[PDB]
């Protein structure tokens, strides 16, 4: 499925090159600008645990998921990955635990040492 394709073909967008955050672009975006630290960012997304069935979607709540990039608000893999994306882009990210919720997890919702998969659409980003 989509996660395995990312394992197989995905680009390693980590600084350390440890395959901790793997990306495939699924719909190319517009322009060349990508968001900077501090930008207010608007996305839709569907996420799940790699092996298993906790699933989650922004669409479930009606509305975009909004956060400030690089400002502590999401897991490290999102600060890394969303920063590489363009307005209108859809991407797949596969994420090792070190860039998500770690050996601790976030129980009861997220287990210890969980790999995550997301599909992200970047709707917009605006300056602080």
Ligand X SMILES: COc1cc2cc(OC)c1OCCOC[C@@H](C)OC(=O)[C@@H]1CCCCN1C(=O)[C@H]2C1CCCCC1
Q: What residues make contact with ligand X under the rule CB under 6 A?
A: 45, 47-49, 54, 56, 65, 74-75, 78, 106, 109-110, 116
75 is catalytic: yes
118 is catalytic: yes
How would you class 51 by CB atoms within 10 Å of its CB: exposed for 0-12, middle for 13-18, buried for 19 or more?
A: exposed
37 is catalytic: no
Question: Do 81 and 69 contact (CB within 8 A), yes or no?
Answer: no
First to last CA, the chain: 38
Which of 75, 90, 95, 120 is the catalytic position? Answer: 75
Which of 42, 65, 99, 101 is the catalytic position? Answer: 101
- Report angle CA 100, 104, 109 to the nearest 5 degrees: 70
Tell me the closest approach of the beta carbon of residue 60 to ligand X, in angstroms: 8
Which of 39, 42, 45, 65 is the catalytic position? Answer: 45
Catalytic residues: 45, 55-56, 75, 101, 118
């Amino acid at each position: 499925g989509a996660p395995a394709t990312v394992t197989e073909q995905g680009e390693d967008i980590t600084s350390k090159k440890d395959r901790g955050v793997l990306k495939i672009v699924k719909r190319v975006g517009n322009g060349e600008e990508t968001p900077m630290i501090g930008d207010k960012v608007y996305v839709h997304y569907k996420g799940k645990l790699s092996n298993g069935k906790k699933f989650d979607s922004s669409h479930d709540r009606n509305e975009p998921f909004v956060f400030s990039l690089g400002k502590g608000q999401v897991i490290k893999a999102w600060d890394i990955g969303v920063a590489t994306m363009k307005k209108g882009e859809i991407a797949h990210l596969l994420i090792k635990p070190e860039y998500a919720y770690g050996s601790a997890g976030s129980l009861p919702k997220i287990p210890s040492n969980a790999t995550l998969f997301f599909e992200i659409e970047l709707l917009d980003f605006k300056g602080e």
